[PDB]
Amino acid sequence: AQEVFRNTVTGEALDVEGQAPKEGRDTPAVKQFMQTGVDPYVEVAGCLPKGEEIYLESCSGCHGHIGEGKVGPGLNDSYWTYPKNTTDKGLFETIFGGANGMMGPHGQDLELDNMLKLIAWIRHIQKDDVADADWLSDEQKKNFKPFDIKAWEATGKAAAEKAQCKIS
Numbered sequence: 001a002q003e004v005f006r007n008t009v010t011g012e013a014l015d016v017e018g019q020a021p022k023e024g025r026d027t028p029a030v031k032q033f034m035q036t037g038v039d040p041y042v043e044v045a046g047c048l049p050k051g052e053e054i055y056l057e058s059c060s061g062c063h064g065h066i067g068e069g070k071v072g073p074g075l076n077d078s079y080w081t082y083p084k085n086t087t088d089k090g091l092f093e094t095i096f097g098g099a100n101g102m103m104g105p106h107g108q109d110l111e112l113d114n115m116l117k118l119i120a121w122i123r124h125i126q127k128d129d130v131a132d133a134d135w136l137s138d139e140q141k142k143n144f145k146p147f148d149i150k151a152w153e154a155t156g157k158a159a160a161e162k163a164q165c166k167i168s
């Protein structure tokens with residue numbers, strides 16, 4: 001059954017159906033996420049360019065173009081202020097409902113399917129060791145390499161763009 005989503009800092013129920021855009025919910029990826037809390041776009045290369053464009057436009061002014069940190073914290077390291085952000089469910093809740101200070105809610109802004117691609121991008125830009133990563137499966141941990149923006153700009157993004165964004 002359905003996940004119940006709660007505000008990261010308060011525990012108040014997030015009204016996902018009430019607040020999310022009407023469009024972009026009817027995808028296999030969203031249906032699995034709303035049931036499971038696991039984001040099936042994670043480490044699907046095909047979903048990454050779109051996650052990156054969303055990120056750059058709305059998040060990187062504060063969190064940095066590669067998640068390095070600016071006004072707001074780094075998102076590309078092993079350390080989390082709110083440690084349930086090591087799960088896709090927690091990260092979704094932080095993004096959807098917001099946190100303290102200048103971190104406001106973005107639930108109302110992003111179609112659910114796009115939210116999931118954004119989260120895949122955030123996972124992809126990780127550059128610390130992932131052996132303990134709560135958001136990767138056993139096989140994914142075996143294949144995950146620290147993000148290198150140089151490779152991404154040279155070859156990574158081009159190849160991602162030619163691939164399909166679809167779940168397994």
Ligand code: HEM
Pocket residue numbers: 009058059061062063071072073075079080081082083085091094095099100101102103104106118
């Ligand atoms: C855009 C949609 C965007 C994303 C994505 C995002 C993510 C994010 C996370 C996951 C956290 C929690 C980090 C952790 O647990 O360690 C977090 C926290 C803060 N952010 Fe953010 N953020 C997005 C957008 C923006 C915008 C545009 C701003 C600045 C105006 C901003 C800033 C902040 C701040 C400040 C925090 C710390 C909040 C806290 O409670 O500690 N983010 N963000």
Ligand SMILES: [Zn+2]
Pocket residue numbers: none
């Ligand atoms: Zn259908």
Ligand SMILES: [Zn+2]
Pocket residue numbers: 060063064065066067068
């Ligand atoms: Zn940057």
Ligand SMILES: [Zn+2]
Pocket residue numbers: 073074075076077078079080081
């Ligand atoms: Zn961090």
Ligand SMILES: [Zn+2]
Pocket residue numbers: 058105106109110
């Ligand atoms: Zn937003």
Ligand SMILES: [Zn+2]
Pocket residue numbers: 153
């Ligand atoms: Zn770039």
